[PDB]
Amino acid sequence: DHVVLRYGGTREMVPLIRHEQMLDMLMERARQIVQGFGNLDTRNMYLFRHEYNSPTLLYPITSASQITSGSILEIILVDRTEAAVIPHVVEPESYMRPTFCDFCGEMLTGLMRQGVKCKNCNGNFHKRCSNAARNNCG
Amino acid sequence: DHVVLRYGGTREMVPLIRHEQMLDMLMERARQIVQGFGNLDTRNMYLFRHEYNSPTLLYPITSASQITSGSILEIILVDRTEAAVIPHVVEPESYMRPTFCDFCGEMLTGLMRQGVKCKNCNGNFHKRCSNAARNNCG
Ligand SMILES: [Zn+2]
Ligand SMILES: [Zn+2]
Ligand SMILES: [Zn+2]
Ligand SMILES: [Zn+2]
């Protein structure tokens, strides 16, 4: 029973308890992830989840209740200068050993053509995942 | 009875009605401001207000009620690659003709030293304003 945090180009699993300070704790993991990149100021750090069935859309998390198990939460420093997205350019791909979707962390499933592969950063994603918000090609 | 919208390096006044679709309308002005910069996609556009007495902090707007008259709302495309802030480097300044705070739009008041002036972008701000979130030096 997890959630996934994402920042920079890094994902991390965090066990999802239902408990009053669940959100406090996710936030401090988030803060720790970002200082993992380098003392970036953190006062306007927010988590945004991807919408059910529509991963191009983000919703800000305000109460612990909006966190549902399995959700992908984005760590976003909202005070910080906007810059152009870098999208994966992607085409279908069949996989012969079990491989995981580089964005969401769950397994590509199916017989053939289990996901898409990006030509420039070589990642492996579900089609629904290859263009999720904040899945930038680094 | 206004609010201020900000995007890019531009501020705009919008009359604040209390009415069910007040937020709908601010959002579509916001969208129009951003396409003023160039067909940037807009599905993850959010407004954030600056906190009372603490302009370095932003809070996302979710219901029309969080909008209070006079507030400075930031227009933020949250799906979009983070980038380092560019802060004003600023020192006090006395003003001899009435001049407005370039960030918030209200007048510098006082007798001497009514605000601060930035050496590189030459702007005029209240001290509380010279380092508000998203008041980047362009
Ligand atoms: Zn890629
Ligand atoms: Zn996936
Ligand atoms: Zn400046
Ligand atoms: Zn001001």
Residue numbers in the entry:
A (entry chain A), B (entry chain A): 12 to 149
Mind quoting what the paper says about this structure?
Protein kinase D is a serine-threonine kinase comprising two N-terminal C1 domains, a PH domain and a C-terminal kinase domain belonging to the Ca2+/calmodulin-dependent kinase (CAMK) family. PKD signaling is tightly controlled by the lipid second messenger diacylglycerol (DAG), which in cells is produced by phospholipase C (PLC) downstream of either GPCR or receptor tyrosine kinase signaling. DAG recruits PKD via its two C1 domains to specific membranes in the cell, such as the plasma membrane and the TGN, where PKD is reportedly active. A second requirement for PKD activation is the phosphorylation of two serine residues (Ser738 and Ser742 in human PKD1) in the activation loop of the kinase domain.
To determine the structure of this module, a construct comprising the N-terminal and C1a domain of the C. elegans PKD homolog DKF-1 was purified and crystallized. Crystals diffracted to 2.2 Å, and the structure could be solved by experimental single anomalous dispersion phasing using the anomalous scattering of the Zn2+ ions in the C1a domain. The crystal structure reveals a dimeric assembly of the protein, in which the dimer interface sits on a crystallographic axis. Dimerization is mediated by the N-terminal domain, which adopts a ubiquitin-like fold. The dimerization interface on the ULD is mostly composed of hydrophobic residues. Using the structure of the isolated ULD dimer (residues 12–98) and the PDBePISA server, an interface area of 751 Å2 and a solvation free energy (ΔG) of −5.4 kcal/mol were calculated for the dimerization interface. To validate the dimerization interface observed in the crystal structure, we mutated the central hydrophobic phenylalanine to a negatively charged glutamate (F59E), the rationale being that two negatively charged residues in the interface should repel each other. Indeed, the F59E mutation converted the ULD and ULD–C1a into exclusive monomers. Aside from ULD dimerization, the structure also revealed an intramolecular interaction between the ULD and its corresponding C1a domain. This interface, in combination with the dimerization interface, gives rise to a unique arrangement of the C1 domains, with their respective DAG binding sites pointing in almost exactly opposite directions and contains three highly conserved residues in the ULD, Arg17, Arg22, and Glu85, that form a contiguous surface on the domain outside of the dimer interface.
